[PDB]
RNA sequence: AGCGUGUGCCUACCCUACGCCGGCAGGCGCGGGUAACCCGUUGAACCCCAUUCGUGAUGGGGAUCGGGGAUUGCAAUUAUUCCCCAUGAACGAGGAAUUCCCAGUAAGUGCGGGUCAUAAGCUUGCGUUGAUUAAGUCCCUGCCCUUUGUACACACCGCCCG
RNA sequence: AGGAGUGGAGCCUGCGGCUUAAUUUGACUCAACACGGGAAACCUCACCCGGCCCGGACACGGACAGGAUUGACAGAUUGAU
C-alpha cells in the first residue's frame, strides 16, 4: 500500500513540514495554520491509547467532538468515535482515508426513505 | 485622527438622537419638550427646554449637575467641555411634545380620558 | 469556566454586530456608521437628519 | 466579588453623585475604573444591589445604564468607607 | 387548585462539602516546649505565597494552593 | 458611461495605484486616499471592426461529476467562494392557463449600494443601446355615480323550499 | 392592437408534503410563497443530543470565624488543561 508514490512505514517518520507536501490544498493549509491546542490533546490520547493496547488488539473506542481532526498517517488503526449530534458512532481508521476528515463518517442524518405522501 | 464628512455628520444625529431619548425617558414626568446643541471652540452648550425649568434644576442648581455629570461621561468627551442649561418653552400650549406629556400624567393620576 | 463561557471567537459575521438601541441582531444597517436596526432607524430618522425627500 | 472590587466601586459613586456603564456582562474591564481590573459585571451587579436598598435611582437609556445618589444613600457611603461632612462632593461647589 | 404538585423535582447532581479539621494550623504546626517551629510541610518559593504561605504534601509531590506549582 | 462607496465608540473587518514572482486564482513589498486632492480620464458590457466555424444535439448549451492549486476563517468534510484540466445531460422556442407595459417606455447590456471575515442567480439605484403598436372602449375583469327591485342587513360566501 | 414573456427544459431560491433526534418558525386570493431586509459553516438560533454557570436583587431565621461558598496540580472520569 501507498500514497502519492510512498508506504506507509515512510509516512510513520515522515516529518511535519515535508508530509504537508503530499497533501491536498484545504489541509495543507490547515497543516500550515497550525494544528491547535485541544488537538495535540487528541493525538496524545490515542499515543495513550496505542502503547497500553496488547500487542494483538486494538484499542479501545475513545470518544471524540473533533469532527475536523485530519485522518494523519500516524493515526491509522485507532478506534476513534466521532460524534453525529446524537451518538458517538464507532470509526476504525484504515490506512486509505489518510486526507479526510474525521467528520465524514458518522453520518449526521437518516437518510430518507418515503412515505405515503399527503395533501400536497 | 479625524473622520470621514460623511460620518461626521451622521454621528452628529446619533449623539442629539440618544440625548434626546434619554431626556424624554429622564424629564418626561417635567414638562420637557426638547434639546438644542451648540458647539463653540472652547465648549458644546447643551440647551433642555421645559416647561417649569425651576423645579427641574433640583434647588440651587442640584439636578443640573448630575445630569452634567452623565451626559460627560456616557459620551466620553472631557470634563469642563460640556454644560448644560434650563430655558422656558414660549408657548406650552403650542408644542405637542408638551400636550402629550401632561395627557399622559392627567391619565396616570386617575382621570377618565 | 474562565477559559470558557465568554471564549467562542466572535471576531466577525452576524452575531458579533448587534443594534445600538435594539441590542438585537437582525436587519442591521452598518452603512456610513449607523449601526442601528432596519426599524430603529426609521423611529429616529428624523432625528440625525435624514429627510425623505423622494 | 472580593473586596478590592467593591470597594473600589463605591469609592467613585461618593466622588461626583453619578455612574453610568453599559449592561455588557461580558465586558473585561469597566473603562472609567481602570488600573483595578473590575469587569461590568462586578459594577452592574454592585449597583444592583444598591437600587433594591433605596440608595441610588436608576434610569435606563439606549443601552447604558445611569445611576444618581438619593440624599440616604451619600450617609451610606459616608458610614462604609468613614467620612467627615467636612469634605463635600460635587453638589456644592458650582453656585 | 388549577395546578398539579407532580413531585418531579430531582435536584440529586451532588456538590461538594469543604472538610476542613478543626484548627488545620495544628496540622500545618507541631511545637515542642522548648519552642521549636516544625513546619511539617513545604513553603512555596514563589513571590507572592513565599515564606508565609504552605504548600500541601501529597502522597507523591508537593502542591501550592495560590500557584498549584508541583515537584515530585 | 452614470449613480455610488472607501481605513469603523465598543470592532476584528478597505478603496487600492505601481514594481517584482506566478498560466491563472493569487503572493510579496511599496506608495496615495477620512476623499471634486488617491483608486480615477472611474481606459464597463452589449455595440463596432477583422479571422475561424457551417445547420448537426455541432465548436450552441452548460448541468452532473473525477483529479489538482489558492485565498477567507478558530473551523471549509453535507462540496463557503475562486482558479486549471477533463466529463459534456436536458433543451429543436414550449399545452390548458396567465403577468407586466405608452417613450428615452419595453427589451437587451453591464455597473454601484444593502447583505459582506468569506460572498449575489436577490433586491435597490444608475447608465448605455434603444423599438413595434395605441392615442380607444366598456366585451371581459373590477371601481364608481344616478334612477330601482328586494321577505338581504354576526348583509348573495345572504335569506330560504321540498 | 401589439412587444417581452412566464407556464415546457436545466439550475438557484422560497412554500407545502414526506423524512427526521431536530429538519425552529410566522405569513395561505389580489391583501402568504427571492417576504420577515431571512444570501443560517460557528455566532446568529429559536430546534435536537450532552454538559458547565448564577449573572437567585432585597427582607427574615439557621451555619457561622472548633468557619460559610469560592479557586486549584496530578490520577480516574470525561468531547474537552
Ligand atoms: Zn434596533
Ligand atoms: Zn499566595
Not at chain 1, 4 to 25: C, N, T
Not at chain 3, 15 to 33: A, M, T
Not at chain 5, 28 to 45: A, F, H, M, Q, T
Request: charged share 30%; hydrophobic share 35%; net charge positive.
Amino acid at each position: 500500500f501507498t500514497y502519492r508514490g510512498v508506504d506507509l512505514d515512510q509516512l510513520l517518520d515522515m516529518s511535519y513540514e515535508q508530509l504537508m507536501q503530499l497533501y491536498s490544498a484545504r489541509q495543507r493549509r490547515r497543516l500550515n495554520r497550525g494544528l491547535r491546542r485541544k488537538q495535540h490533546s487528541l493525538l496524545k490520547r490515542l499515543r495513550k491509547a496505542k502503547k497500553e493496547a496488547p500487542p494483538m488488539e486494538k484499542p479501545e473506542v475513545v470518544k471524540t467532538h473533533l469532527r475536523d481532526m485530519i485522518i494523519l498517517p500516524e493515526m491509522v488503526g485507532s478506534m476513534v468515535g466521532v460524534y453525529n449530534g446524537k451518538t458517538f458512532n464507532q470509526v476504525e481508521i484504515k490506512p486509505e482515508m489518510i486526507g479526510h476528515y474525521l467528520g465524514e463518517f458518522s453520518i449526521t442524518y437518516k437518510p430518507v426513505k418515503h412515505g405515503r405522501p399527503g395533501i400536497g | 485622527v479625524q473622520i470621514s464628512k460623511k460620518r461626521k455628520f451622521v454621528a452628529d444625529g446619533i449623539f442629539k438622537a440618544e440625548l434626546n431619548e434619554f431626556l424624554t425617558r429622564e424629564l418626561a414626568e417635567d414638562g420637557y419638550s426638547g434639546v438644542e446643541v451648540r458647539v463653540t471652540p472652547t465648549r458644546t452648550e447643551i440647551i433642555i427646554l421645559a416647561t417649569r425649568t425651576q423645579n427641574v434644576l433640583g434647588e440651587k442648581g442640584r439636578r443640573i449637575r448630575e445630569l452634567t455629570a452623565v451626559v460627560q461621561k456616557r459620551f466620553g468627551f472631557p470634563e469642563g467641555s460640556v454644560e448644560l442649561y434650563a430655558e422656558k418653552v414660549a408657548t406650552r400650549g403650542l408644542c405637542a411634545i408638551a400636550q402629550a406629556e401632561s395627557l399622559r400624567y392627567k391619565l396616570l393620576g386617575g382621570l377618565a380620558v | 469556566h474562565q477559559q470558557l463561557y465568554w471564549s467562542h471567537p466572535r471576531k466577525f459575521g452576524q452575531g458579533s454586530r448587534s443594534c445600538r438601541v435594539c441590542s438585537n441582531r437582525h436587519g442591521l444597517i452598518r452603512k456610513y456608521g449607523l449601526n442601528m436596526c432596519r426599524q430603529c432607524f426609521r423611529q429616529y430618522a428624523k432625528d440625525i437628519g435624514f429627510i425623505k425627500l423622494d | 466579588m472580593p473586596k478590592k472590587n467593591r470597594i473600589a466601586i463605591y469609592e467613585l459613586l461618593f466622588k461626583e453623585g453619578v455612574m453610568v456603564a453599559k449592561k455588557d456582562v461580558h465586558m473585561p474591564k469597566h473603562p472609567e475604573l481602570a488600573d483595578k481590573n473590575v469587569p461590568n459585571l462586578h459594577v452592574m451587579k454592585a449597583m444592583q444591589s444598591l437600587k433594591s436598598r433605596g440608595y441610588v435611582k436608576e434610569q435606563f437609556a439606549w443601552r447604558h445604564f445611569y445611576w444618581y445618589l438619593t440624599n440616604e444613600g451619600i450617609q451610606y457611603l459616608r458610614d462604609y468607607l468613614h467620612l467627615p461632612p467636612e469634605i463635600v462632593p460635587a453638589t456644592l461647589r458650582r453656585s | 387548585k388549577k395546578r398539579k404538585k407532580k413531585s418531579c423535582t430531582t435536584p440529586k447532581k451532588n456538590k461538594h462539602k469543604r472538610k476542613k479539621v478543626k484548627l488545620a494550623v495544628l496540622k500545618y504546626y507541631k511545637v515542642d516546649e522548648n519552642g521549636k517551629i516544625s513546619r511539617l510541610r513545604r513553603e512555596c518559593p514563589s513571590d507572592e505565597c513565599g515564606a508565609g504561605v504552605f504548600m500541601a504534601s501529597h502522597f507523591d509531590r508537593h502542591y501550592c494552593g495560590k500557584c498549584c506549582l508541583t515537584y515530585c
